[PDB]
From a paper:
The asymmetric unit of the crystal lattice contains three independent copies of the SuhB monomer forming two crystallographically distinct dimers: chains A and C associate as one dimer, whereas chain B forms an analogous dimer with one of its symmetry mates. The active site of SuhB is situated in a cavity carved out at the N-terminal end of helix α7, sandwiched between layers II and IV. Structural elements of the active site required for metal and substrate binding include the IMPase signature motif 104DPXDGT109 (superscripts denote residue numbers of the SuhB sequence) between strand β4 and helix α4, the 82GEEG85 motif at the 'tip' of the β3-β4 loop, the 209G [ST]AA212 motif in the β10-α7 loop, in addition to Glu228 in β11 and the 234WDXA237 motif in helix α8. The interface of the SuhB dimer buries a total of 2696 Å2 of solvent accessible surface, calculated using the PISA interface server, or 1348 Å2 per monomer. The present data support a model of Mg2+-dependent dimerization, where loading of the three catalytic metal sites in the active site induces ordering of the mobile loop, promoting dimerization likely by expanding the dimer interface.
Synthesis of phosphatidyl inositol is dependent on free myo-inositol, generated through dephosphorylation of myo-inositol-1-phosphate by inositol monophosphatase (IMPase). In contrast, SuhB appears to be a bona fide IMPase with little or no activity towards fructose-1,6-bisphosphate. Like the human orthologue, SuhB is activated by Mg2+, and inhibited by lithium. Apart from minor discrepancies, the SuhB monomer is identical in fold to eukaryotic IMPases, with RMS deviations between Cα positions of superimposed backbone structures ranging from 1.09 Å to 1.15 Å.
Author numbering:
A (entry chain A): 5 to 34, 54 to 85, 98 to 253, 260 to 286
B (entry chain C): 5 to 34, 54 to 85, 98 to 183, 186 to 253, 260 to 286
Write the structure that this text describes.
Amino acid sequence: DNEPARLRSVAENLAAEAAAFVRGRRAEVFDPVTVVDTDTERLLRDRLAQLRPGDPILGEEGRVTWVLDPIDGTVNFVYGIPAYAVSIGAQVGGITVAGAVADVAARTVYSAATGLGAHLTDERGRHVLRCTGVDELSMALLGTGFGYSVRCREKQAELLAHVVPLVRDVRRIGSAALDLCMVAAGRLDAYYEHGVQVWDCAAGALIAAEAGARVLLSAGLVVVAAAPGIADELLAALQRFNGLE
Amino acid sequence: DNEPARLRSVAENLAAEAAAFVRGRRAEVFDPVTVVDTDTERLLRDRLAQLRPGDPILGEEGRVTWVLDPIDGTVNFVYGIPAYAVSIGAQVGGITVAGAVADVAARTVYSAATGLGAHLTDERGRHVLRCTGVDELSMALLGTGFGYRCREKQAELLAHVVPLVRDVRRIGSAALDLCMVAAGRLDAYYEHGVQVWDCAAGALIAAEAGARVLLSAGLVVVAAAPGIADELLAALQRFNGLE
């Protein structure tokens, strides 16, 4: 119809399809990432033309709006680090109503829709996602990334050094979409990145949110996603050093 | 016999076995990591008693010497991030002659022996490992970790090198980082404070893949594609980290 449940199914299906295509195209090809990225963007646009005729598409290169990234984690893709993803978000008035992130190398798909919860789908079927119940920020495993391009990186690194001793450990994986899903699944306790494009966090953000996580999205965005027991304590430490703004 | 080729086979086999056991034990159990870590240590010690009778064993908790870590990446193991490894190194006089690192969730095994090259073994059979041919440190993908107190200084140091490199990866397993360098999935790796049983095997593997590797109670580890090693060592010294 156009309800969240319907929107997430098309999101799940397209994500899974596109993952299969990326997985296959990468093997053939191996600029080279530009090729697969474009090809997969084309696949998604065409499939959306047939499944969702009049719907707007905001791509990485250009009523519900489909916000997408065929390959989030392009560095990872080029190096063969199994941590790149297809992200498909369904937005209405700038709010994400449904979404799906496909972990290409893992052959799994995370998805969610407003009010309906977040699930992970793999060979063993579909599972409910729930973030962790950490209380002490010194017990939290935090993921981060460098957002945008080479400009303004050392400051972000400087900021992180300050938060490093306040937390259990840090992870830097190379994919914003996948970090948001880890938080949802409980593989990270929180995630923080400064400068994330909308098409890389829109889907994941919802997924983490529907998994009970605290999520705030302040040309990129500032993203904070954390288990609820630890969100305030983390936001304070970040503000304390200027990062959540 | 006791030659590198023989030493690496027993390393490969033990790594593969132990990975299978960890993979199984983790599913049962899910302190909880302490349990699996000990159990797997016991498996390796017993198997080494039967395959390599008189050989000394330096474990994470205690003529060739088998240096080993049943689960490198214990935080990863606990959270379900597929990046923990079994590491088995064969040392003679403190020098690593052969080694194997099993990537437990990937179901793959990396191995090497002095003069015999580094290989990766997976479903598609055995492959030769070679690190990348990067020249510009600004083009290099660098992996890091923290080894152990004092963490903020290490982070401070990294912020300085961050703009000199393509991007940074922090995965949670030194054994796996060294193997990623060998495979070409990272261009270099740097960590300050790495126990011997987490880097001995990987260090050899990266080295046998053509990487520049130096090991300065833990150790300082630098492993990099050759075309970029000097340039990286300089930047590190320039901020005090390779010491």
